[PDB]
Amino acid sequence: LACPAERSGHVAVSDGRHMFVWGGYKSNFYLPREELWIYNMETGRWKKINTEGDVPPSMSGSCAVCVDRVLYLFGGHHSRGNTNKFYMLDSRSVLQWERIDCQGIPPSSKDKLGVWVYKNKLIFFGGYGYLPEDKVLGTFEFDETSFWNSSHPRGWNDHVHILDTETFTWSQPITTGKAPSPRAAHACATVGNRGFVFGGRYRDARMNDLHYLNLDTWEWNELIPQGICPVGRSWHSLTPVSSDHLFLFGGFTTDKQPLSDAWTYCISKNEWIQFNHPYTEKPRLWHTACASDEGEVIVFGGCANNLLVHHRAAHSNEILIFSVQ
Ligand SMILES: O=C(O)CNC(=O)Cc1csc(-c2ccc3ccccc3c2)n1
């Protein structure tokens, strides 16, 4: 049966029963832009389709959502750099991509960010990319390691941007509270009107902090769980599994250890619980995770070692199924 190629930095979005996989890169360039891979969470079978229309460039680090079987794609890194273009693919009724001429001030061109979905709003936070074209709300910190290797320097931001799907208009909310530090390769998860974010890379650390932005008031809150917390990391996944639990898997520590640990964050108790699973010998970073209607968390792709050593990188095509409910 047909089987998608290994990759990291891809996107994966789900309607609870089907998982849509697009993009990413591997070793041994970018996976083909026109392909969309569909994994049936109930039958474990893959199915590939060719998409047409305004097919986005081949990219790593893009940020995607699925809302009522409409897929939206923002940002990423292609052969000629980062982007801030916005695409839509309606997976309801050959599938055609639409590139949206958004109104308003878009985010800076960037990748490795996250998104919360709340009613008509797609809310994007953070990431890695070029200096912004405007003194938009937030801060931006250059990554000094990008000064002497490329032609365009890059850095981290803490920006929050709203894409309103009633009008495809970009805006930025005026927030209160301590926003998280600028960061990339963090993970975001949404429960109700709370947009959680955990970890990420910033300057010389991969972080262990946990915050949530209230998506109704726009007030930041930093969460301080008691007792043992997971080690700081980037390139991990964070996924809602109930109205009270976020599921964490994998990532990459400050001192460059690939991770195979898994935790559940209980929101009501403000406590982490380590989760026991049979994939302890399968660390993953820059994988994706999607929750199914059937209580599972489906992890796909990602790299089993330090992907920054690109000629030795072990990118995966495996499906890891976590039975959290
Ligand atoms: O460092 C983190 O945890 C997340 N990264 C950042 O925040 C910014 C950054 C700075 S360089 C880089 C990066 C990414 C992927 C690569 C894949 C192959 C080869 C080199 C690669 C280099 N990313």
Author numbering: 26 to 53, 61 to 125, 129 to 360
How did the manuscript describe this experimental structure?
CRL2KLHDC2 has been proposed as an attractive additional E3 ligase handle for targeted protein degradation. Specifically, KLHDC2 recognizes substrates possessing a Gly-Gly C-terminal degron (C-degron) sequence. First, crystal structures showed KLHDC2 binds substrate C-termini in a well-defined pocket lined by aromatic residues available to engage a ligand. Ligands were identified that engage the C-degron binding site in KLHDC2, subjected to structure-based improvement, and linked to JQ1 for BET-family neo-substrate recruitment.
A co-crystal structure of SJ46411 bound to KLHDC2 confirmed the predicted stacking of the hydrophobic face of the naphthyl ring in the binding pocket. This analysis revealed that linker attachment to position 8 of the naphthyl ring would generate an exit vector closely matching that of a natural substrate. The data showed a greater than two orders-of-magnitude selectivity of SJ46421 for KLHDC2 over other KLHDC-family CRLs. Consistent with this view, SJ46411 and SJ46421 alone were only able to inhibit KLHDC2 substrate ubiquitylation and largely inactive towards other the Kelch family E3 ligases.
